[model samples]
Target: NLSESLISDCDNLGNFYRGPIVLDINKEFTIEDVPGDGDCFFHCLAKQLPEVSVSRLKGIITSYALRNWDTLTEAPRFYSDPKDYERELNRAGYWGGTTEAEIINHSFGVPVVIWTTEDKKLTSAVQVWTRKHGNLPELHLLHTGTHFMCLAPIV
Candidate 1:
């Protein structure tokens, strides 16, 4: 019953967006639901990546940010207290759309693109990391309300 309500809510929200984007491919896919934990974004991406655990991924992201503290902090309004980097990273509630891109890109060497629409106007898709080098797979991460979900192509 609870699950049904959640599904209905998601369906209702989908109606707000323009019809689903269709591709001319013959491939079928499935959606995997991650836990409702604050680390949804990280968990989603980690599920798709090869072998690495979610906790490890978090560590990688935290380490990367610490290593580049100077640059990360140089940007205004990026971090409130640069010294409290570890605390922020360790707590799942503190991470989300803001830092997920850089962390995923650096940790996995893959590109992350976020698609969003505002007031019926479709905004340009922003590529999180650098352009694709070879034939690396790209995954789309969606942020709706306060939750993050991942979409991927399944074999």
Candidate 2:
């Protein structure tokens, strides 16, 4: 399994390490591993979206990040320079974390719900996105340290 979790002792107190502390969140979702051959992040989201394959998704995200580079939204925060951002995004395994997740909500034109070992006050926005908009897929992706795993509800 290419899937891995955070080392849990990356914070708190004076910061102590007690062996390999596995980090996780209690959610009723099974691990659906996607290939980690560089493009796993895209693969995970692509699985949720049958409309676009991983290849197309990468191209699509790159285009979105480029076209709206100067807009100074989420992606721009980490990628201050558009040139570096585009290049990094085009290169698989390099683009993940805050950057790709930022654009996914817009690029895919849907709300994203990410469940991980930590908490992000992100519920309010997604809740609103669903209420006003139609009942579309609530694309839920799981985040490990720097990798992504698709969450298939225990169905």
Best by TM-score: 2
Work out candidate 2's RMSD over C-alphas. 9.8
Q: What is the lDDT of candidate 1?
A: 0.50
Alpha carbon deviation, residue 73, candidate 1 (Å): 7.2
lDDT of 1 at 102: 54
Tens digits of per-residue lDDT, candidate 1, 1-155, equal 11122233232331111223323222423345577468477777777776667788778777777676554422114666545656766785754664656555544556665433232232222223443244457655555445656654445
List of clashing residue pairs for candidate 2: none
Off by over 4 Å in 1: 1-32, 71-76, 80-83, 117-128, 132-136, 153-155
Tell me the TM-score of model 1: 0.60
Residue 137, candidate 1: Cα error in Å is 2.3
Query: Candidate 2, after superposition: displacement of residue 135 in Å?
Result: 5.6
Q: Which ten-residue region of model 2 has the weakest summed lDDT?
A: 123-132
